[PDB]
């Protein structure tokens, strides 16, 4: 009898709780397994469509969600009244989708908020007003899935980070990395140096230092799948960067769908997650599709990076 | 997006229900998948022990059960107060276990009752008093799993019978036979004719008639796994019998763990399920391990069988 | 590192052999796995068609076969000259196919013969003449697959019987039952007693004796899948019967596709396999689709059965 | 009926051939599947040991190999006389093994030579003399496996490159990428820029040019698994580099076990594969563990790289 994700979730709630969160996590597990099946058999943008359809179908039928936000879509979806729960969920169903052809890691990301007290959502207008009142610091849960040689699911509910691995023989996520802690330092950096010429001078200096300083040798790793690179960062330590550049002034990653959920996971594991001006989680949501640069990882590595920006 | 068992259960409950039954059925699905894994790899009893351990671990951690009864054990188990639900569940974790060596069907069976109103169970004594007040007609749910070349799960909640099949690629039970209806007649009988000499004379006459009547030709099938034989009976029609014998005066099958759950499924599919004196479901529970003979299946086939007894 | 079926076959041939048999067994393993995949996902006669297609496609491309005979087809198939080997293979791609709906055992069966020396086959006429010269005693290999909760492959090449189990994690058959020996006696019988009224009197007497004798209690098991019932018989012991009955004027099982391959397996495991007049393997093949009754299993159980037939003379 | 790797191999040999190569490829397929099983369940250097054991056991029992060379071992292994074939096989059983912990791509690589005519090998001394007479241009076959979200097997026998994917439902490699052709140009480069300060000046200039030239924008990808990075390079195009270090010692792959097999694949797909002085495949083998830098990929990308080296 191994410890399943479902068991872990049930145990970690107060005795005789409402159970909305359990149903939500059932729906997410199912979605992840359906996406994994499709990825395994790829050889024999279609994957994007399927992944989106799956997440929406299972989440809407869970009875747990009020509002759904998929990164691929322009508007939020409001659940129908009869099966309307109290969670707002924003997800990237399949990050790094081009990578499938070369058999490299891809991933899914989600962040979960709760309806503020004395608030209802009967339309997209209501939902738009509600998200403007929220911040990453109000997020009750976040997680991601990594589809590689194993399928991992990493999750937080505000009390640290736990990693699960899909046992394909029983179709259940099993606990394999309890209490993930990102090391305070580690000499690995992860960025696309192809964009060097577009970067801000302070960040060029930081990267040049990593390569040319006399004291500490650094290794570079850039898979080109944000989930894969962050997952490695969490377990090994290091830094992952999507810096500001001249062709993408507001940054690369979407706040709601990618950067804020990942920031919550990284902070809960003991790392740092910053944007252009402090913590990602402290930024206001003005826009459903707003963006930010990111500097994530081991807390002393992010401090060294910010020291070049400062001054 | 296929229809999962979990989705079916959630949809079939009132909007915003308590959700105890969903958690129970999650625990049962997980147990069935764990048992299937072990059966698939047999060779490369022990299976009885593992199967019992699995059912108990997942059911007790579901938060849905007050009291657990395993066929293999002398006493019922009371769930601890912090995670105590309102279902009484009696299960046979692995019927036909010897059959594994020859790669023939095996199965699991369960029946679920609810705490009567104004009743509590804080001990085995309480639980013993409670089951004496219950009958099969008070049973809220029943089901079985068949472990063969496919893994099937057949289930009722009082509104007919539905069959699911395990999709090993996603580890979910998928709906495959909605609204199972047992034919009113079919010329198949299922009994161990090796025990011929120990049977009551009326049942010898019935069996002799099936073989020697001039009007209707009958086929015999006896797998020797009760779940496998009942599963065939449900889908094809026919009759399944464990008649009274001179060496086993009170019958072979245990009422709570096997006969009553199977009787509820057979009745809900439109068949008949009788013992020595009428419906199995109408018998009083006096004893935890009490037994009964059974005559199950197509309603006209069971009527013909009872006509020999009545003469 | 577990012992695969392929490894077992390679090891059991003379050093630096031709290797036709290895390629044949690869093709059969592949066919079995493809059929298993389809059976596992049934629900979510189509199975018959797929199974037949699979066996033919993989066997013909193996380069090992001269002639193919599928139970479902009226004629044999001759491999094209460029990829023509020296094995004649007769197979039942999917026995008990109706059973799939109720999730009971199904199976595949095959028997392999070799071209007699100084013989060629360039047509169906040639192939028809060749099979008339052969008997079950000339069969070089036989096996079956059982598709249940596990997938088993049981095989003989004339030196006993070995059982393999499919490891779904690596897609290989692994050795699990080396040197299968059927017990000399065991009180289990397997027959469809629904057909009682159509049986010969001596066989009714035999069945009545199993039920009513004062000395030995017998259990009845009849799955209704020949491969499943035979597989149980091999491992537990007992008897399996498809006796002669008034409806069937020559018996139920086809000699080439089912009865002779199963007979070779049962004999190689230490049992007996008889028809209406002695060993199944000693019967002449007059007809591609000829049939026979069968009495298979533990040697003392088959002797008791034949004793009832002998006393009725 | 899909086209299996085994079928493809049999069809691609002359009618009624000896069949040694088929048995060899069976043994390799089995080894790859065994390694995949172990990788899938990681979590739930041990992998290195298991992988080595698997390759050796299955290859030695194939009857197809005369001599075995594993990258991990100091000496070659001679097959015992009774089961001695005519292939010399040099393999890296598991490249990138550390990566398993972070769920990133790993791989296996092999290259196959044939006994020269009128030559025998009854000892390690004989085998040592034989390899000194060979070059990469005499190699009869090469391939690799990539263990990611799918399991790929890419193979050449001197007539182009074909890619297969493992169907986990039937345990067979299925043809999915026939006739792989690497594009003549593509703006992707793959190197570890953490080693910048140890590189030769010409290669620093080349890398600086890729980042800062006014004409062509380049993307960087470095998974940190040689097989993963080469696999992407083959399918998408680009360049993969393990440059020579200024110290002339570091920045080298092993010729026999990694560089020459990968060079044969890249050339057969229409790319270029060069070392310090021309084609990898034209280098003489002076010893078993000899090394070389590599510049592999799209033919115009490798030409641009060599132009910086030339002046």
PDB file of C-alpha atoms in Angstrom, chain C residues 189-193 195-211 239-245 293-296 301-302 304-312:
ATOM      1  CA  UNK C 189     -12.931 -33.442 -15.215  1.00  0.00           C
ATOM      2  CA  UNK C 190     -13.765 -30.885 -17.873  1.00  0.00           C
ATOM      3  CA  UNK C 191     -16.672 -31.452 -20.296  1.00  0.00           C
ATOM      4  CA  UNK C 192     -19.938 -29.722 -21.347  1.00  0.00           C
ATOM      5  CA  UNK C 193     -22.604 -31.838 -19.548  1.00  0.00           C
ATOM      6  CA  UNK C 195     -24.675 -32.286 -24.270  1.00  0.00           C
ATOM      7  CA  UNK C 196     -25.345 -35.380 -22.092  1.00  0.00           C
ATOM      8  CA  UNK C 197     -28.239 -36.707 -24.168  1.00  0.00           C
ATOM      9  CA  UNK C 198     -26.180 -36.642 -27.389  1.00  0.00           C
ATOM     10  CA  UNK C 199     -23.271 -38.712 -26.018  1.00  0.00           C
ATOM     11  CA  UNK C 200     -22.396 -42.356 -26.630  1.00  0.00           C
ATOM     12  CA  UNK C 201     -23.561 -44.682 -23.824  1.00  0.00           C
ATOM     13  CA  UNK C 202     -20.047 -45.660 -22.715  1.00  0.00           C
ATOM     14  CA  UNK C 203     -19.197 -41.984 -22.091  1.00  0.00           C
ATOM     15  CA  UNK C 204     -22.404 -41.395 -20.116  1.00  0.00           C
ATOM     16  CA  UNK C 205     -21.373 -44.325 -17.945  1.00  0.00           C
ATOM     17  CA  UNK C 206     -17.916 -42.857 -17.426  1.00  0.00           C
ATOM     18  CA  UNK C 207     -19.327 -39.494 -16.403  1.00  0.00           C
ATOM     19  CA  UNK C 208     -21.892 -41.156 -14.088  1.00  0.00           C
ATOM     20  CA  UNK C 209     -19.033 -43.089 -12.462  1.00  0.00           C
ATOM     21  CA  UNK C 210     -16.983 -39.904 -11.803  1.00  0.00           C
ATOM     22  CA  UNK C 211     -20.020 -38.485  -9.964  1.00  0.00           C
ATOM     23  CA  UNK C 239      -9.072 -34.717 -17.968  1.00  0.00           C
ATOM     24  CA  UNK C 240     -10.453 -32.578 -20.774  1.00  0.00           C
ATOM     25  CA  UNK C 241     -13.032 -34.157 -23.155  1.00  0.00           C
ATOM     26  CA  UNK C 242     -14.826 -33.286 -26.350  1.00  0.00           C
ATOM     27  CA  UNK C 243     -16.467 -36.653 -26.846  1.00  0.00           C
ATOM     28  CA  UNK C 244     -18.243 -37.903 -29.914  1.00  0.00           C
ATOM     29  CA  UNK C 245     -21.881 -36.853 -29.993  1.00  0.00           C
ATOM     30  CA  UNK C 293     -13.030 -36.061 -30.703  1.00  0.00           C
ATOM     31  CA  UNK C 294     -10.425 -35.703 -27.935  1.00  0.00           C
ATOM     32  CA  UNK C 295      -9.708 -37.135 -24.496  1.00  0.00           C
ATOM     33  CA  UNK C 296      -6.670 -35.299 -23.048  1.00  0.00           C
ATOM     34  CA  UNK C 301      -7.483 -40.326 -15.888  1.00  0.00           C
ATOM     35  CA  UNK C 302      -7.420 -40.908 -19.667  1.00  0.00           C
ATOM     36  CA  UNK C 304      -9.983 -44.786 -16.743  1.00  0.00           C
ATOM     37  CA  UNK C 305     -11.988 -43.046 -19.490  1.00  0.00           C
ATOM     38  CA  UNK C 306     -10.764 -45.492 -22.142  1.00  0.00           C
ATOM     39  CA  UNK C 307     -11.611 -48.433 -19.859  1.00  0.00           C
ATOM     40  CA  UNK C 308     -15.299 -47.549 -20.159  1.00  0.00           C
ATOM     41  CA  UNK C 309     -14.958 -47.397 -23.976  1.00  0.00           C
ATOM     42  CA  UNK C 310     -13.097 -50.758 -24.057  1.00  0.00           C
ATOM     43  CA  UNK C 311     -15.647 -52.601 -21.992  1.00  0.00           C
ATOM     44  CA  UNK C 312     -18.413 -51.548 -24.448  1.00  0.00           C
TER      45      UNK C 312
END
